[PDB]
């Protein structure tokens, strides 16, 4: 198990645009691509992003490689973040990978807010994280997810996901 197959399990995989949780338009791998409510705007960005003219719809492969930039992309923002660094310095390789869900999903900003669990994180107080983290909006809105992150964070093994 890594995180590519992690959020491919989390995310799901589609070739055309769709609607997430939120009622964004996004395709792929969870690839969000705007949060206007055009799907003309949606459009636009998908062809930007691909370099081509998709309408609406890309391959398995363009998939693919959108998700390749994202995780990339989340990966180097926690290296630059100077609250989120420090705490996935201090974390073994499961854990790391909890983190990096986290980010893709919600972004650096988002994440940087779960201030109180990062810090027991940091501490590796491991229970007590898990039950703060879930007091949030993120867990009441995406529950499944949510505990399978959650439990990847207070355990250290890939249980939840197998
Ligand atoms: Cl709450
Ligand atoms: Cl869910």
Redesign the pocket.
Known sequence: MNIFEMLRIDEGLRLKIYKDTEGYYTIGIGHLLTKSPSLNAAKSELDKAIGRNCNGVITKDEAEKLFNQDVDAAVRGILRNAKLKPVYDSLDAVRRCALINMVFQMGETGVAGFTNSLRMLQQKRWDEAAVNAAKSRWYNQ?????KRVITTFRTGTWDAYK
């Open positions: 995406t529950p499944n997810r949510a």
